[PDB]
Design an enzyme around this catalytic site. Sequence first.
Site, PDB file in Angstrom:
ATOM      1  N   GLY A   5      35.984  37.264  45.746  1.00  0.00           N
ATOM      2  CA  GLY A   5      35.986  36.570  44.513  1.00  0.00           C
ATOM      3  C   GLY A   5      37.199  36.765  43.626  1.00  0.00           C
ATOM      4  O   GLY A   5      38.233  36.441  44.020  1.00  0.00           O
ATOM      5  N   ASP A   6      36.998  37.201  42.403  1.00  0.00           N
ATOM      6  CA  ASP A   6      37.968  37.395  41.463  1.00  0.00           C
ATOM      7  C   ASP A   6      39.244  38.134  41.724  1.00  0.00           C
ATOM      8  O   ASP A   6      40.189  38.553  41.225  1.00  0.00           O
ATOM      9  N   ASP A   7      38.802  39.098  42.655  1.00  0.00           N
ATOM     10  CA  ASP A   7      39.564  40.130  43.175  1.00  0.00           C
ATOM     11  C   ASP A   7      40.046  40.122  44.754  1.00  0.00           C
ATOM     12  O   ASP A   7      39.513  39.531  45.299  1.00  0.00           O
TER      13      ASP A   7
END
Length: 333
Positions: A176-178
């Site tokens: 995801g965002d990481d």
Amino acid sequence: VANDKKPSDRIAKIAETFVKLMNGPFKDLDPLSIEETIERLLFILKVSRYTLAYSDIVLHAEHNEHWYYPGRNPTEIADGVCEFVSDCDAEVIETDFSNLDGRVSSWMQRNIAQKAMVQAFRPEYRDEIISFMDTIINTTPHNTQYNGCVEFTALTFEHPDAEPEDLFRLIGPKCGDDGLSRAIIQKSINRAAKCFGLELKVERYNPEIGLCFLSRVFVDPLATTTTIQDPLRTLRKLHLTTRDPTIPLADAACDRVEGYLCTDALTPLISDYCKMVLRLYGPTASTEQVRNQRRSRNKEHPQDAHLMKQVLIKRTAIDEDQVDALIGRFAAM
């Protein structure tokens, strides 16, 4: 904030190669029945019925385990992170995106996610999936697909002379965002984000302050896999509770501290706060069965204890004598 920043001509071939590598050997797929989707894991169901199957089939395959970390247990996440840091010899970079779902462009949406879904699913289901994607344009898998696309773009820009399959085989863990990537493309990642039209935040790995990943801090990833909640994000806000007003403060605090014990039992400067919350709000809270029958209930290594303490101090930039004074003040209250 919708954006319509189409990528350059050259980047399109890189995106197509990344999409094809994502496809791999899974040419054909079939949709899942409603009952199976419901027992898996309105508006969420209609997209989930296809996206869960697509993720489980393609994104959880043998040739797509190198990058698609999203979708595994936290123990598996820790094992993968430790393996990746051992492979990179503590030379890794972190990516932090701001409102990715609110910033992905129409071209990216219609040339990465839509293409992947159409190639993964059967032709007879093309209309339904295309309609669902069109409705989406005007959840979890989209962020992973965007992260994989950006990683593929960075790898293509770093080594334009290597074969696309070999380039993609080096894709590190992404969730995801990481995500994680090699530090050798720290400066070139910004240019790739500008070409696609995305904003990227990158920070060099520093053992003194630990490594940030999934709001988790690795105290010493070189040797130990011990990990704790992110102190930077939570310490400045843990004293304030963001629960809805209808819940009593005691129940929300008890649930928060129970989760913290489940994840951060032996973390310095958080265990004392959790224990003091349990001591103060604990007896004054309501019955735990009552909160287990209540909707808002889900709305929330000992050997290296010294090293974890020092890593937390470095993360919070608080002197050891100051840390001891704070610990004494918290316990005595």
